[PDB]
Amino acid sequence: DDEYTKLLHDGIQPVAAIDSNFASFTYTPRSLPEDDTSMAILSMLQDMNFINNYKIDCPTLARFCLMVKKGYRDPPYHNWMHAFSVSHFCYLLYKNLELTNYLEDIEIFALFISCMCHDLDHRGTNNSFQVASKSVLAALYSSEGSVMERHHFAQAIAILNTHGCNIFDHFSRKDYQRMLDLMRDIILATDLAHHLRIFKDLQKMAEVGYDRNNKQHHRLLLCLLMTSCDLSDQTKGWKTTRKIAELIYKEFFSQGDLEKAMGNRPMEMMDREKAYIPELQISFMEHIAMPIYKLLQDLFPKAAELYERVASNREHWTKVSHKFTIRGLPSNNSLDFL
Ligand SMILES: COc1ccccc1CCOc1cncc2nnc(CC(C)C)n12
Numbered sequence: 001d002d003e004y005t006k007l008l009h010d011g012i013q014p015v016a017a018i019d020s021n022f023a024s025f026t027y028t029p030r031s032l033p034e035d036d037t038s039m040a041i042l043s044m045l046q047d048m049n050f051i052n053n054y055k056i057d058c059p060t061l062a063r064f065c066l067m068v069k070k071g072y073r074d075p076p077y078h079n080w081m082h083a084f085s086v087s088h089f090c091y092l093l094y095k096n097l098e099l100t101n102y103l104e105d106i107e108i109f110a111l112f113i114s115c116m117c118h119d120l121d122h123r124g125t126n127n128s129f130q131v132a133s134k135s136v137l138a139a140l141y142s143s144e145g146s147v148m149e150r151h152h153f154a155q156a157i158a159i160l161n162t163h164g165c166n167i168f169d170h171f172s173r174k175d176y177q178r179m180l181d182l183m184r185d186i187i188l189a190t191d192l193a194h195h196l197r198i199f200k201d202l203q204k205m206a207e208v209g210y211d212r213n214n215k216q217h218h219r220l221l222l223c224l225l226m227t228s229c230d231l232s233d234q235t236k237g238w239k240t241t242r243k244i245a246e247l248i249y250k251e252f253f254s255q256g257d258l259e260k261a262m263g264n265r266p267m268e269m270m271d272r273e274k275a276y277i278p279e280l281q282i283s284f285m286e287h288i289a290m291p292i293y294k295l296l297q298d299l300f301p302k303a304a305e306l307y308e309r310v311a312s313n314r315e316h317w318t319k320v321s322h323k324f325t326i327r328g329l330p331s332n333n334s335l336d337f338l
Pocket residue numbers: 192230231245248281283284288
């Protein structure tokens with residue numbers, strides 16, 4: 001494979017070469033062409049000193065990055081561009097929030113690798129759909145819960161177990177065991193049902209203050225940071241929020257259509273005939289995204305701008321809701337749509 005040849009023999013490009021604003025919270029990683037994303041991953045890993053610190057073999061790393069990218073399918077939202085944008089936000093947190101004062105180096109490295117792998121082989125359907133459709137994934141994981149997240153983790157392990165792809169094969173038994181355990185915890189933390197279960201523990205940690213000597217605080221912070229990366233499309237401008245809503249609802253309505261064909265009644269948000277996008281977006285902002293970034297701001301004062309962008313994006317949806325009502329006649333001047 002020629003992509004691999006170039007990635008290995010051409011040299012890792014400097015991060016600043018990608019974009020002058022690459023390391024800023026205002027940068028939109030989705031603006032980077034998909035063909036440049038595997039090289040951007042290598043550049044971020046190098047800028048974070050992970051390649052040198054952990055003595056990662058370059059042929060192995062190049063193969064791993066390409067295998068992770070190939071491990072994503074093309075649904076509208078849960079594709080490689082989502083994994084890349086989530087990974088870029090983890091890199092932004094490292095560059096702007098001084099994570100090294102809070103987490104161990106192996107934990108920051110595990111968070112980044114988990115961001116790359118966290119939605120591997122997503123089929124554009126959620127956990128409830130797996131169970132309702134009696135998929136092979138549900139047969140394997142429904143008794144434990146977080147069906148898709150267990151599959152994402154198993155796919156990540158399967159890549160590491162592919163010959164020539166194990167970026168941690170030279171690690172000590174203890175460090176290897178630690179990496180794979182962190183990966184499990186972090187990928188499982190991407191289930192928003194898990195986030196909602198631990199929300200009160202996250203609030204309590206923010207209230208008492210982060211204790212770097214408390215192992216449970218490390219586990220909780222990793223969970224919060226992973227959720228913050230996964231929802232990071234909400235921290236950019238209105239243009240990103242709007243585009244992401246189109247992608248998410250295209251994916252959800254496709255599931256809703258499959259559910260109807262199965263004879264089931266899909267949830268309102270999955271039903272293209274019932275869903276009212278501005279209301280659904282405002283609800284997700286108020287009850288999920290805004291509390292996450294408010295917690296992040298409470299723990300990291302420098303994360304204030306992220307909460308303010310999510311709050312402003314919620315106000316933009318309220319501002320444009322009136323446009324979802326047809327006033328006067330449509331463009332064609334006919335009422336044929338009735
Ligand atoms: C009340 O809505 C929710 C509560 C909990 C979990 C799920 C949702 C559905 C709406 O989700 C979303 C809506 N807009 C943006 C967004 N980004 N990430 C996600 C989760 C999605 C990929 C599963 N989003």
